[PDB]
Amino acid sequence: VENPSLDLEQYAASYSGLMRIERLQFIADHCPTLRVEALKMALSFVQRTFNVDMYEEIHRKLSEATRELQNAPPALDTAWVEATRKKALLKLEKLDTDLKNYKGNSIKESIRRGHDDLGDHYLDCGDLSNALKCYSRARDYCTSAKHVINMCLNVIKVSVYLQNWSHVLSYVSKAESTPEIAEQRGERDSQTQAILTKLKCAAGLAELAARKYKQAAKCLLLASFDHCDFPELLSPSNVAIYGGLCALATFDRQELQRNVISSSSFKLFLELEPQVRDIIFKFYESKYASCLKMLDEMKDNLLLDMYLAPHVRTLYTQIRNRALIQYFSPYVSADMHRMAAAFNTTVAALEDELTQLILE
Amino acid sequence: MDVFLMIRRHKTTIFTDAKESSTVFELKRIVEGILKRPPDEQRLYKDDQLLDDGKTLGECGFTSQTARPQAPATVGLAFRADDTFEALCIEPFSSPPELPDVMK
Amino acid sequence: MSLKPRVVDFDETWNKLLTTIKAVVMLEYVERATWNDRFSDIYALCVAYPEPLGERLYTETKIFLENHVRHLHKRVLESEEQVLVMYHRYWEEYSKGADYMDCLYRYLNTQFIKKNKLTEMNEPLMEIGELALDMWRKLMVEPLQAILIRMLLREIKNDRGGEDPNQKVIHGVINSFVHVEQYKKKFPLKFYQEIFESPFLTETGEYYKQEASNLLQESNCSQYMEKVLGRLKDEEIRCRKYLHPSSYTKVIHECQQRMVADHLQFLHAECHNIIRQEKKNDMANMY
Amino acid sequence: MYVKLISSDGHEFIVKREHALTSGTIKAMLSGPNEVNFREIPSHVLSKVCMYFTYKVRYTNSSTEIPEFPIAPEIALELLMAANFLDC
């Protein structure tokens, strides 16, 4: 399933990390011939951030892609591999020795800082269990509540890839509801602090996985336009797509005029989204043809959105059903031929759609 | 690694400490922390390698499992002369029969 | 381990053990050579298989320690304040002496504290230090309270006038009060507060009130208040010579409240006078 | 001055003055800067505890490998149950 409506230049700019690898994965799942160059750019990315195992994994899957490039038209710097890996293991011993030295120095700020940095370097390894040890030994070893917040932020950055939302959501809610957010200030009194909007993105991924999408969009409502920055999760066009379309899919028309048009916190995000704004305009003016048209056009690009990909099929089905209810409501006698013109369909297949709706 | 050496004779047994990046000259300076010995006219012999003062163990390769703390490959001490070697007596343990249960 | 019979070698080890311990009982002058002897004691303890033996051995050590304390109790039988100094010497050395015993004891601790101790019947297994304090408090009964605290009281007298016989002795007697306290160390402070402090507060408060009151009438009351301010400080001085955390804390304010009864009125009256006529220093002291 | 360990089977090991920080226990018994003795138990316990102490002086604060100490094959269940019997 190949959609060429993607912007990898923005995702190279606004993002980095595993998602640069992972969206290629959906390329590698469904959307080919968009793969090898971003695979080599990701291979050059994993030439940084201390990662050798996954570097060799990208070299291996790039060799697979090279076997595919025996029809269509890899780099293993083993000197770099051995040098960086021995430097990383020796610095693991350096920081174990420094952990000894700083327990000798006994600064829980600096000790728990070392726990945080070691968990960061185990993210740099991919050792989510060892980073879980380090942040588990940064867990109740902090000084202020802000540092517990930063710990839970790092654990949520891991939880981007953990997604084991039984107690991964206990860490997510440990950042959300637990730490008396900014100690009764609200990310220090009119947030620019990219924490609560990270909790928007985290709840979006979580109830993407845990499928209570109404509460996910309910989280995604009130994001702040001030920061909008992270090179793995937060770009305001993509999070704007997230919030606007989850709110369009999950919320009633009472709230679709009451909390979508009125959403001033999210207003500049839809200023970043002209097409989402036009879909909003056509759907609220009940212009079903071009609205569901643009909906199903960007359905392929939100199928290119890897995590939204299984759920966009459900939710745009719901939005089309919402449009059909929007048509069916105000009348006693509607021509289906008018409805065939309105929903860009036939009569009989439209009738089968409506019969599927007649079922419940 | 950070290598806890075990210079092991029958009774001459020094548990000293060194690195993978450590040399032999300053190891003898740590032997000078043991029994106050000049490195210059002495050579730590293992009967395995010509080990002069400036030879680095990264060139030798005393890694973590090749030189463990509780059980290294010991950079050998000589019973100090030009070409001698402290007699390596790695001390034996006990040899049990199959598992008793009374001693738990 | 299975090296030899666990029961047998008590006597030889104990002989070496006592030989070295006596050298340390409060202090037999252990030197480096003697330390070597103590190490041979390490040999003695280590040769034994002290698993059933060590507790008995420590018990024997306890008995010897107790008799030594008794010997010292015989030794406390002396003159006046010289004894305070001697007692201070006993306590000072005794801590070190028992401490060295503990050093020898260090291995025994791992033998029974790790394995099995009461502290985890009349057979306790704990520190020699905790043991020594208990044995030592037996010493603490008569000489501490009878002479030593009284001497400290005289030192209080020295606060009123004179200078403290030696603080080594007198403060040390206070320390004797504290060391000889509950072995549990639940109340480390209690003896000084119980035996001594009541008459301390009583006499000090009463004397300052009475004398200072007479002198207050005699020598310029406003300034005399300043003098009282100094007076309590002098009390503080001597209370510093021999000290306990509870005495000075209460006794100073006690005098303040006592004396203010004489002049609650002059405080504001003279204060008003300060308002009327600027007297900053009087204001400072009065403040 | 300098110290020395003695075992039941004669492990009379010369133990340092200055940099003996690899040891923990004998540092308490530095009668200097000497006859440390553990002769009543056979050395299958004593040398085990000494090598485990060298092991243990190193391998603290180690988020990497802290290996379970190798214990004899007929007691390969006491490979774990040396926690029950001989602390390794």
Short mmCIF file of C-alpha atoms in Angstrom, two decimals, chain C:
data_model
loop_
_atom_site.label_atom_id
_atom_site.label_comp_id
_atom_site.label_asym_id
_atom_site.label_seq_id
_atom_site.Cartn_x
_atom_site.Cartn_y
_atom_site.Cartn_z
CA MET C 1 34.54 -25.67 57.77
CA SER C 2 35.01 -29.40 58.06
CA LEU C 3 38.61 -28.77 58.96
CA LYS C 4 38.52 -30.05 62.50
CA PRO C 5 36.35 -30.78 65.43
CA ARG C 6 34.31 -27.71 66.27
CA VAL C 7 34.14 -28.35 70.02
CA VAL C 8 37.74 -28.96 71.11
CA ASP C 9 40.18 -26.05 71.01
CA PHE C 10 38.75 -23.69 73.62
CA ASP C 11 41.46 -23.61 76.27
CA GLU C 12 44.58 -22.79 74.33
CA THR C 13 42.75 -20.13 72.41
CA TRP C 14 41.22 -18.74 75.54
CA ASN C 15 44.58 -18.58 77.27
CA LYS C 16 46.04 -16.54 74.44
CA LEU C 17 42.77 -14.66 74.34
CA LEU C 18 42.85 -13.63 77.97
CA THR C 19 46.55 -12.96 77.80
CA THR C 20 46.00 -10.37 75.09
CA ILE C 21 42.72 -9.04 76.49
CA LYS C 22 44.11 -8.35 79.93
CA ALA C 23 46.63 -6.26 78.06
CA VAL C 24 43.67 -4.20 76.86
CA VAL C 25 41.32 -4.23 79.89
CA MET C 26 40.72 -0.49 79.97
CA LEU C 27 44.40 -0.36 79.07
CA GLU C 28 47.39 -2.62 79.74
CA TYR C 29 49.52 -0.54 77.33
CA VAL C 30 49.00 -2.23 74.02
CA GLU C 31 51.76 -1.22 71.65
CA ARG C 32 52.56 -2.39 68.16
CA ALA C 33 54.40 -5.42 69.47
CA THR C 34 51.48 -6.05 71.77
CA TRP C 35 49.28 -5.52 68.77
CA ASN C 36 51.21 -8.35 67.23
CA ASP C 37 50.32 -10.26 70.35
CA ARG C 38 46.73 -9.31 69.75
CA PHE C 39 47.14 -10.64 66.24
CA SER C 40 48.36 -13.88 67.70
CA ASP C 41 45.07 -13.60 69.54
CA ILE C 42 43.50 -13.35 66.10
CA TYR C 43 45.30 -16.58 65.45
CA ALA C 44 43.89 -17.99 68.67
CA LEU C 45 40.33 -17.03 67.83
CA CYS C 46 40.72 -18.19 64.25
CA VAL C 47 42.25 -21.55 65.20
CA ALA C 48 39.31 -22.45 67.50
CA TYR C 49 36.16 -22.91 65.44
CA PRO C 50 34.45 -20.54 67.85
CA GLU C 51 30.96 -21.46 66.73
CA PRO C 52 29.81 -22.88 70.05
CA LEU C 53 33.04 -21.71 71.65
CA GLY C 54 33.02 -18.02 70.81
CA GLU C 55 29.98 -17.14 72.86
CA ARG C 56 31.48 -18.87 75.86
CA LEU C 57 34.77 -17.21 75.12
CA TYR C 58 33.13 -13.80 74.95
CA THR C 59 31.31 -14.72 78.14
CA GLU C 60 34.64 -15.38 79.80
CA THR C 61 35.77 -12.06 78.41
CA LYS C 62 32.69 -10.50 79.98
CA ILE C 63 33.50 -11.98 83.36
CA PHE C 64 37.06 -10.76 83.22
CA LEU C 65 35.81 -7.39 82.05
CA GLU C 66 33.44 -7.23 84.99
CA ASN C 67 36.11 -8.14 87.47
CA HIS C 68 38.35 -5.52 85.95
CA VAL C 69 35.58 -3.00 86.40
CA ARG C 70 35.36 -4.16 89.99
CA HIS C 71 39.09 -3.67 90.28
CA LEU C 72 38.60 -0.17 88.96
CA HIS C 73 35.78 0.32 91.44
CA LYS C 74 38.34 -0.55 94.06
CA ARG C 75 40.53 2.01 92.27
CA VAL C 76 37.89 4.72 92.44
CA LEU C 77 38.32 4.38 96.17
CA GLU C 78 40.30 7.58 96.48
CA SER C 79 40.27 11.19 97.63
CA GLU C 80 38.17 14.04 96.27
CA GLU C 81 38.33 15.73 92.84
CA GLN C 82 41.53 13.94 92.03
CA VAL C 83 39.19 10.97 91.64
CA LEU C 84 37.17 12.87 89.09
CA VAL C 85 40.29 13.13 86.99
CA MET C 86 41.06 9.49 87.68
CA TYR C 87 37.52 8.49 86.76
CA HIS C 88 37.78 10.53 83.60
CA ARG C 89 40.96 8.64 82.91
CA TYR C 90 39.18 5.38 83.58
CA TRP C 91 36.32 6.17 81.25
CA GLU C 92 38.55 7.54 78.52
CA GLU C 93 40.87 4.57 78.55
CA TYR C 94 37.99 2.19 79.19
CA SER C 95 36.28 3.15 75.98
CA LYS C 96 39.52 2.63 74.09
CA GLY C 97 40.36 -0.50 76.05
CA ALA C 98 37.00 -2.09 75.40
CA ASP C 99 37.31 -0.75 71.88
CA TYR C 100 40.47 -2.73 71.30
CA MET C 101 38.64 -5.64 72.82
CA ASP C 102 36.02 -4.94 70.18
CA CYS C 103 38.74 -4.91 67.55
CA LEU C 104 39.68 -8.41 68.61
CA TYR C 105 35.93 -8.99 68.89
CA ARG C 106 35.41 -7.86 65.31
CA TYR C 107 35.81 -11.41 64.01
CA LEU C 108 33.60 -12.78 66.77
CA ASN C 109 30.91 -10.40 65.72
CA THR C 110 30.76 -11.93 62.28
CA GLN C 111 30.89 -15.27 63.94
CA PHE C 112 27.67 -14.71 65.97
CA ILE C 113 26.02 -11.46 64.80
CA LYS C 114 25.82 -12.67 61.27
CA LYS C 115 24.90 -16.17 62.35
CA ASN C 116 22.99 -16.09 65.59
CA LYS C 117 22.67 -13.56 68.35
CA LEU C 118 20.13 -12.80 71.03
CA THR C 119 20.18 -9.20 69.87
CA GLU C 120 18.71 -10.16 66.53
CA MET C 121 17.51 -15.48 78.98
CA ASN C 122 20.60 -14.11 80.69
CA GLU C 123 22.67 -15.02 77.68
CA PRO C 124 22.94 -11.99 75.50
CA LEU C 125 24.98 -11.76 72.32
CA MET C 126 25.79 -8.19 71.40
CA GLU C 127 28.62 -5.69 71.28
CA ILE C 128 31.37 -5.64 73.87
CA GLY C 129 30.84 -1.89 74.00
CA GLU C 130 27.21 -2.28 74.94
CA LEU C 131 28.37 -4.93 77.36
CA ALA C 132 31.05 -2.68 78.80
CA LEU C 133 28.66 0.17 79.39
CA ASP C 134 26.40 -2.15 81.34
CA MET C 135 29.28 -3.56 83.34
CA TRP C 136 30.64 -0.05 83.81
CA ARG C 137 27.39 1.46 85.06
CA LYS C 138 27.72 -0.91 87.97
CA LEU C 139 30.77 1.21 88.78
CA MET C 140 28.66 4.32 88.20
CA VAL C 141 26.36 3.86 91.14
CA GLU C 142 28.17 5.29 94.15
CA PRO C 143 31.07 7.46 93.03
CA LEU C 144 29.29 9.25 90.25
CA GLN C 145 26.27 10.47 92.14
CA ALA C 146 27.78 10.66 95.56
CA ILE C 147 31.04 12.51 94.93
CA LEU C 148 31.24 13.39 91.26
CA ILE C 149 27.93 15.02 90.78
CA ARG C 150 28.37 16.84 94.05
CA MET C 151 31.76 18.02 92.84
CA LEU C 152 30.05 19.19 89.69
CA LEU C 153 27.69 20.98 92.02
CA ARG C 154 30.67 22.59 93.71
CA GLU C 155 31.79 23.53 90.23
CA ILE C 156 28.41 25.19 89.95
CA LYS C 157 29.55 26.84 93.14
CA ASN C 158 32.66 27.63 91.14
CA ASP C 159 30.31 29.24 88.66
CA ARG C 160 29.02 31.46 91.45
CA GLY C 161 32.58 32.01 92.50
CA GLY C 162 35.86 30.26 91.97
CA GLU C 163 36.93 28.14 89.05
CA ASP C 164 36.35 24.58 87.96
CA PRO C 165 38.45 21.87 90.04
CA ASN C 166 39.38 20.30 86.72
CA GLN C 167 36.74 20.04 84.04
CA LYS C 168 38.47 16.89 83.06
CA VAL C 169 37.19 15.51 86.30
CA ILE C 170 33.95 17.43 86.78
CA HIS C 171 32.69 17.46 83.24
CA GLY C 172 33.93 13.94 83.17
CA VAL C 173 31.77 13.24 86.18
CA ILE C 174 28.85 14.58 84.21
CA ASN C 175 29.98 12.22 81.48
CA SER C 176 30.10 9.53 84.13
CA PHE C 177 26.51 10.35 84.89
CA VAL C 178 25.62 9.99 81.24
CA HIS C 179 27.74 6.92 80.49
CA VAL C 180 26.49 4.95 83.52
CA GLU C 181 22.89 5.60 82.44
CA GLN C 182 20.44 3.00 81.16
CA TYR C 183 22.31 0.31 79.28
CA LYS C 184 19.56 0.42 76.70
CA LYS C 185 20.54 4.06 76.44
CA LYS C 186 16.89 4.87 76.31
CA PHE C 187 17.57 7.75 78.67
CA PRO C 188 21.12 8.81 78.26
CA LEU C 189 20.50 12.12 80.07
CA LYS C 190 18.51 10.96 83.09
CA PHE C 191 20.88 10.63 86.04
CA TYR C 192 22.16 14.18 85.89
CA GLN C 193 18.65 15.46 85.53
CA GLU C 194 17.32 13.20 88.25
CA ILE C 195 19.91 13.28 91.02
CA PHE C 196 21.63 16.63 90.54
CA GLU C 197 19.45 19.00 88.53
CA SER C 198 16.68 19.57 91.03
CA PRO C 199 18.95 21.05 93.65
CA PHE C 200 20.82 22.72 90.83
CA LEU C 201 17.80 24.58 89.55
CA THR C 202 16.64 25.25 93.06
CA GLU C 203 19.82 26.70 94.46
CA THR C 204 20.85 28.54 91.35
CA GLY C 205 17.47 30.10 90.77
CA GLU C 206 17.02 30.95 94.42
CA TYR C 207 20.49 32.31 94.89
CA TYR C 208 20.42 34.44 91.79
CA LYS C 209 16.99 35.72 92.64
CA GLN C 210 17.91 36.63 96.19
CA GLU C 211 21.44 37.90 95.68
CA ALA C 212 20.71 39.64 92.42
CA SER C 213 17.66 41.19 93.96
CA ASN C 214 19.65 42.65 96.83
CA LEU C 215 22.34 43.81 94.43
CA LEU C 216 19.59 45.01 92.18
CA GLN C 217 18.42 47.36 94.86
CA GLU C 218 22.01 48.17 95.79
CA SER C 219 23.55 48.89 92.46
CA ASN C 220 21.67 50.86 89.83
CA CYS C 221 18.75 48.63 88.96
CA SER C 222 18.59 49.45 85.28
CA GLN C 223 22.28 48.74 84.86
CA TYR C 224 22.01 45.88 87.30
CA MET C 225 19.55 44.26 84.92
CA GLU C 226 22.44 44.41 82.51
CA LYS C 227 24.56 42.95 85.27
CA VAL C 228 22.10 40.10 85.65
CA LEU C 229 22.33 39.68 81.92
CA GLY C 230 26.06 39.22 82.44
CA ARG C 231 25.46 37.09 85.54
CA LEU C 232 23.52 34.45 83.71
CA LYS C 233 26.24 34.48 81.11
CA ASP C 234 28.73 33.73 83.87
CA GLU C 235 26.44 30.91 84.87
CA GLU C 236 26.65 29.91 81.25
CA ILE C 237 30.43 30.06 81.49
CA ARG C 238 30.67 27.59 84.32
CA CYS C 239 27.82 25.57 82.89
CA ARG C 240 30.10 25.36 79.89
CA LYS C 241 32.95 24.13 82.06
CA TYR C 242 30.89 21.17 83.06
CA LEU C 243 27.97 20.76 80.76
CA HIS C 244 24.81 18.76 80.17
CA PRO C 245 22.22 19.62 77.60
CA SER C 246 19.40 20.28 80.08
CA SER C 247 20.86 22.46 82.85
CA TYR C 248 21.62 25.87 81.36
CA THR C 249 18.63 25.70 79.12
CA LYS C 250 16.19 25.92 82.03
CA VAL C 251 18.19 27.67 84.72
CA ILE C 252 18.79 30.92 82.81
CA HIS C 253 15.18 31.74 82.00
CA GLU C 254 14.26 30.54 85.42
CA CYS C 255 16.19 33.42 86.95
CA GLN C 256 14.74 35.79 84.38
CA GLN C 257 11.19 34.92 85.25
CA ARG C 258 12.03 34.96 88.92
CA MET C 259 13.57 38.44 88.86
CA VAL C 260 10.98 40.00 86.60
CA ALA C 261 8.49 39.45 89.38
CA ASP C 262 10.48 42.05 91.28
CA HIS C 263 10.40 44.42 88.41
CA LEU C 264 7.78 43.79 85.82
CA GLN C 265 6.94 47.49 86.03
CA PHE C 266 10.40 49.00 85.70
CA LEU C 267 10.82 47.20 82.45
CA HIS C 268 8.22 49.33 80.74
CA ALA C 269 8.80 52.27 83.05
CA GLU C 270 12.45 52.58 82.18
CA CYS C 271 11.63 51.60 78.63
CA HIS C 272 9.21 54.50 78.53
CA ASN C 273 12.02 56.52 80.01
CA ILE C 274 14.16 55.38 77.09
CA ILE C 275 11.39 56.60 74.85
CA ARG C 276 11.40 59.84 76.82
CA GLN C 277 15.20 60.15 77.07
CA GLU C 278 17.13 58.33 74.40
CA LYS C 279 19.12 55.58 76.06
CA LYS C 280 20.07 53.21 73.27
CA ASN C 281 22.35 50.87 75.18
CA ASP C 282 19.91 50.45 78.01
CA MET C 283 17.43 49.87 75.26
CA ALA C 284 19.70 47.21 73.83
CA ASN C 285 20.16 45.33 77.07
CA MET C 286 16.53 45.78 78.06
CA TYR C 287 15.51 44.57 74.63
#
